[PDB]
C-alpha cells in the first residue's frame, strides 16, 4: 500500500486520457472536413442534373428531391454530431500563474520513468536548466504537454535505447526538446507496454501537412498555441531520429 | 494527528480529473459512433434514388448519366471514408479491453461516494442518500473501469440535480447480476446554469437533454455503457427531461 504511487498512477492515467481526449477532437475535426468533400461532390453533380431537368414531370422531381434530402440529412448529421461537440472547446482556455520550472521538469521526468519508460527499458538522459527559473503559464497544461511529448518519444523507442530531454530557458522562451530514435516495430508491438492505443501509435506514422502534428501530440500543439508558443516535431518513420520541440514565452 | 478515513484530497482531485477526461473521451467516441451508424441510411436512400433516376433518364442525353455517375461516385466515396475517419479512431473503446479480478465492493462504493461528494455534490448542495450492501460482497470485474462507471453515473445524476435535491444510490445482487441504481430529479435549469459548478462541459449537459432513440444513452454516459457491455452486462437509463425522475442502472455479472 503506497498512496504516493497511487497518486502517480492516477496522474499518468489522467494525462493519457487528456492526450486521447485531444486526439478525439482532431478525429472529429478531420471527420467533419473529410466527409464534406463527397457531400460537396454529390451536391454539385446533383445541381448539374437539377439545371438540365427544370422541365421535369413529377416523378423526376420527386427522385431529385430524394437525392437532395439524402445530402441535407448528411449535412445536418455532421452539424449535429461532429461539429456541435466542439462548439466551445475549439479555443483552449488556460490559467497562467508563476511556477518553478525545474520541479515540474523533475516531476515530469519521474512520472514518465514510473509510468512507462522503466518498464520499456528506455533510458531518459535529462539536461535541465540550472538555477531556479520560473514561468508564468498554466502549470497543469504544461505538465500534460511535457508528459505527452516525452511519453510519445518513449513509445517510439526500442528497449535499450535512450531518449534525450533537454530544456532551456533564457529571457525570451522556455524550450523543451525531446529526441528519440524511432523503432516502428516497438511502437506497434502488442506485447510491449503502451500508454496510448494502437490507432494513436499507427496514426503517428502517417505523413501530414507542415502545419500539422501527429494526433497523439494534439494536446501539445493546442497547449503551446494557448500560451502563445509553438510545438513541432519531425515526421515519425522507422529508423529516424526525431526531435519534438515545445516553446512557450517566459 | 489526524486519522485518515478516505483517500487523500490530492488523490481525489487527480481521480476526478482522470475520470472526467475518460467520460469526455467516451463521449467523443459516441459522437463518432453515432455519425458512423446514421450516415448509412441517407447513403442507402440516395443509392436507391440514383437507380430510379438512372432508369427514368435511360434514353436522355448521356451527360445526364454522367452527372448520375458523379453522384454515385460521391456516395461510394462517402461509404469508403466511414471506416477510416469514424470507425478506426474509436476502435478501442468500441471493444473496451478490461481485466477482471476479485475485489471487495463496499470499499469501492465508499471511495466513489467520497469522490463525488468532494468533487461536485457538496459544492452543489446535493445529498447522495446511499444504501450500502450488507455483508462483505465481492465482485470479479475491472475495478478501475467500474469505479469510472459508478463515478460517471453518480456525477451525471448530481449534474441533473438542483440545490437541496437528492440522489439515491443503492446496490443489489439480483441473481447472478450485481446492479447499482442511481435515482435523481432532473432540473434542466441546474444542468445549464454556468454560475453552478460542473464536472462535464456545457455540450455534454446540453446533449443529455436531447431526444434520442431509447437504445441510445446520453453521450456523457457512454463510458458506463461500454464498461457494462465489456463485462457482459447492461446499462439502462430513462431520458433526461426537466421535472422527470430518472433512474440509471448499471448491471454486471458478479462472477467474471
Ligand atoms: Co478542404
Amino acid at each position: 500500500v503506497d498512496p504516493a504511487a497511487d497518486l502517480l498512477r492516477e496522474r499518468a492515467a489522467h494525462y493519457a486520457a487528456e492526450a486521447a481526449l485531444f486526439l478525439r477532437d482532431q478525429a472529429l475535426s478531420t471527420a467533419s472536413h473529410d466527409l464534406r468533400s463527397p457531400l460537396n461532390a454529390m451536391h454539385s453533380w446533383a445541381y448539374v442534373l437539377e439545371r438540365q431537368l427544370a422541365s421535369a414531370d413529377p416523378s423526376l422531381q420527386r427522385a431529385l428531391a430524394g437525392i437532395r434530402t439524402g445530402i441535407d440529412q448528411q449535412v445536418a448529421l455532421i452539424d449535429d454530431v461532429l461539429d456541435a461537440p466542439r462548439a466551445e472547446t475549439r479555443t483552449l482556455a488556460i490559467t497562467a500563474q508563476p511556477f518553478a520550472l525545474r520541479p515540474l521538469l523533475d516531476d515530469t521526468l519521474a512520472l514518465v520513468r514510473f509510468a512507462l519508460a522503466d518498464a520499456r527499458q528506455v533510458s531518459i538522459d535529462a539536461t535541465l536548466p540550472d538555477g531556479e527559473p520560473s514561468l508564468s503559464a498554466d502549470r497543469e497544461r504544461v505538465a500534460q504537454a511535457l508528459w505527452t511529448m516525452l511519453t510519445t518519444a518513449v513509445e517510439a523507442s526500442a528497449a535499450g535505447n535512450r531518449v534525450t530531454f533537454a530544456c532551456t530557458r533564457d529571457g525570451a522562451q522556455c524550450v523543451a526538446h525531446v529526441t528519440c530514435g524511432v523503432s516502428a516495430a516497438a511502437l506497434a508491438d502488442p506485447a510491449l507496454p503502451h500508454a496510448f492505443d494502437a490507432f494513436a501509435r499507427r496514426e503517428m506514422l502517417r505523413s501530414r501537412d507542415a502545419k500539422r502534428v501527429a494526433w497523439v501530440l494534439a494536446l501539445c500543439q493546442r497547449v503551446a498555441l494557448a500560451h502563445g508558443g509553438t510545438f513541432t516535431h519531425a515526421a515519425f518513420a522507422d529508423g529516424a531520429v526525431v526531435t519534438l520541440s515545445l516553446a512557450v514565452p517566459c
Side-chain angles (χ1 to χ4, degrees), chain A residues 21-50 52-87 89 91-168 170-188:
Chain A
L21 182 55
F22 280 77
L23 179 146
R24 301 321 202 260
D25 277 0
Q26 187 52 57
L28 292 164
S29 171
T30 291
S32 169
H33 171 275
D34 292 0
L35 291 167
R36 287 171 197 280
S37 291
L39 273 177
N40 294 335
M42 293 177 246
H43 182 268
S44 71
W45 284 113
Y47 184 87
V48 167
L49 269 185
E50 292 171 26
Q52 306 200 230
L53 297 179
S55 66
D57 77 295
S59 63
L60 265 71
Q61 293 297 335
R62 176 180 177 183
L64 290 166
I67 289 303
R68 175 160 52 247
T69 296
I71 294 172
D72 287 330
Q73 284 170 346
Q74 297 181 66
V75 171
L77 186 57
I78 287 163
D79 295 330
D80 192 64
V81 164
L82 301 172
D83 288 349
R86 306 179 298 115
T89 346
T91 294
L92 178 67
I94 63 175
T95 299
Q97 288 285 285
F99 64 92
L101 168 67
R102 181 61 176 284
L104 178 61
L105 296 178
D106 287 328
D107 295 340
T108 304
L109 247 208
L111 181 57
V112 176
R113 290 169 168 162
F114 171 83
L116 183 65
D118 282 8
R120 287 279 295 266
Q121 289 173 268
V122 175
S123 304
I124 306 186
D125 294 324
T127 288
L128 299 184
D130 46 329
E132 183 85 278
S134 87
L135 183 72
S136 182
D138 187 311
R139 191 191 189 280
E140 180 68 38
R141 286 304 192 187
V142 172
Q144 295 164 7
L146 290 170
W147 175 94
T148 300
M149 317 161 60
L150 191 52
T151 297
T152 295
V154 173
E155 279 273 36
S157 299
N161 286 9
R162 319 186 73 81
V163 169
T164 65
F165 181 40
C167 186
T168 62
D170 53 26
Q173 298 178 82
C174 299
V175 194
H177 303 291
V178 177
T179 310
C180 63
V182 175
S183 168
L187 186 67

